[PDB]
Amino acid sequence: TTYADFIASGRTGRRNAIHD
Amino acid sequence: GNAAAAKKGSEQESVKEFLAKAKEDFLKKWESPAQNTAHLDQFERIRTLGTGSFGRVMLVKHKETGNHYAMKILDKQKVVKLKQIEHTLNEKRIQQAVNFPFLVKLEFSFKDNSNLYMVLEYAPGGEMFSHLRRIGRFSEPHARFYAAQIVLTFEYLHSLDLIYRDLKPENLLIDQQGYIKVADFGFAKRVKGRTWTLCGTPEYLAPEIILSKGYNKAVDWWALGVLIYEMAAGYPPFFADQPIQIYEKIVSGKVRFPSHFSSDLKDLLRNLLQVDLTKRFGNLKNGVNDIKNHKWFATTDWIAIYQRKVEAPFIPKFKSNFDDYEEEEIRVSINEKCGKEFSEF
Numbered sequence: 001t002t003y004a005d006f007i008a009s010g011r012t013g014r015r016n017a018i019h020d
Numbered sequence: 021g022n023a024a025a026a027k028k029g030s031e032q033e034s035v036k037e038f039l040a041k042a043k044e045d046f047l048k049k050w051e052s053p054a055q056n057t058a059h060l061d062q063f064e065r066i067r068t069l070g071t072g073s074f075g076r077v078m079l080v081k082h083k084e085t086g087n088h089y090a091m092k093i094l095d096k097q098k099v100v101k102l103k104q105i106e107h108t109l110n111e112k113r114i115q116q117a118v119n120f121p122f123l124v125k126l127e128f129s130f131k132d133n134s135n136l137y138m139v140l141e142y143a144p145g146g147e148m149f150s151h152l153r154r155i156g157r158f159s160e161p162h163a164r165f166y167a168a169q170i171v172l173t174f175e176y177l178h179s180l181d182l183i184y185r186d187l188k189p190e191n192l193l194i195d196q197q198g199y200i201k202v203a204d205f206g207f208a209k210r211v212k213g214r215t216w217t218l219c220g221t222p223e224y225l226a227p228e229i230i231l232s233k234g235y236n237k238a239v240d241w242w243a244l245g246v247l248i249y250e251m252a253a254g255y256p257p258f259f260a261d262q263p264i265q266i267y268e269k270i271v272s273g274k275v276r277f278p279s280h281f282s283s284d285l286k287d288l289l290r291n292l293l294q295v296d297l298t299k300r301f302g303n304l305k306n307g308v309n310d311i312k313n314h315k316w317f318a319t320t321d322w323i324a325i326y327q328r329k330v331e332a333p334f335i336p337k338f339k340s341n342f343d344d345y346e347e348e349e350i351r352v353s354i355n356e357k358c359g360k361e362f363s364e365f
């Protein structure tokens with residue numbers, strides 16, 4: 001499932017802005 | 021309705037008159053910014069609430085009133101190293117000037133030898149991000165309640181020639197009444213016409229930003245599409261392990277919706293997550309009214325939302341429940357750092 005894919009990803013925590 | 025979005029006059033004139041007065045209020049503060057309105061020693065530091073690239077955000081108590089605030093600390097040297105001087109100046113100048121129910125107030129600001137300090141209105145419910153991840157996803161009516169507040173907030177900000185540029189659940193706080201407050205004006209900018217800075221958060225960047233094209237307030241409307249999707253699905257419309265993989269998805273022109281999304285929700289999102297700027301809702305002849313008059317918002321009483329008269333779908337439990345951080349005492353250097361760069365702060 002797409003949800004399971006998301007939960008197992010490295011991007012489920014707070015996401016930093018790009019300061020370029 | 022498309023006919024309703026392209027309509028005047030009475031209700032549209034009421035919005036106009038409100039926004040006209042709001043601009044007058046904003047311009048006064050924009051031209052004469054509040055500066056040096058407190059000092060560090062007036063605040064008892066309680067605990068760390070979160071961290072940014074420039075320092076901790078602390079829960080503090082104002083000693084002479086007992087009021088609680090969130091104090092964002094920015095190490096001046098770190099701001100300089102990250103080439104964020106002008107963005108930080110924008111952030112404080114804009115935030116002290118705005119006034120809207122769904123915007124976090126900048127209550128006091130000041131600086132010392134080492135740091136800049138932004139003393140913010142405290143939201144006891146914490147970040148939407150925390151609740152969204154724990155609960156998994158929000159129902160459509162729940163997502164809609166929040167989305168409506170963002171729509172009105174962007175209508176307000178855009179009318180002042182502001183672009184927000186960092187919409188995400190991490191930057192949305194929930195107050196005691198269950199309503200939203202937009203936090204973090206780090207990338208907010210007042211600009212008529214186009215701008216070019218590659219900034220934002222990867223999952224939320226519009227294609228035109230990634231493609232180095234020159235862009236405007238339509239990037240905020242794209243970001244709203246991403247937010248609504250993430251709130252309703254529990255995951256963003258474009259995700260991967262690495263940013264570059266995310267960008268390829270954003271620019272591809274392709275989006276897949278969960279099977280539980282209503283047909284109205286999907287239609288709205290197709291119109292917000294539109295790569296073509298001449299077709300993106302929020303960026304057409306009818307402006308924000310294309311969004312406000314969309315089927316998905318048919319049940320939304322915009323005035324009632326603004327007045328905080330709608331029952332919130334969710335009020336965070338208050339009491340123990342805070343995220344724990346390792347604490348360290350603030351050291352203020354005996355030498356002024358970066359005085360010239362931050363003179364107007």
Ligand SMILES: Nc1nc(Nc2ccc(S(N)(=O)=O)cc2)nn1C(=O)c1c(F)cccc1F
Pocket residue numbers: 068069070071077078090124140141142143144145146147150190191192193203204341342343
């Ligand atoms: N103004 C403001 N209020 C809060 N409230 C708050 C309450 C509890 C928690 S937690 N998860 O339990 O540690 C966190 C925050 N934050 N806040 C901010 O500007 C702020 C922000 F936008 C993002 C991150 C941290 C902040 F501090």
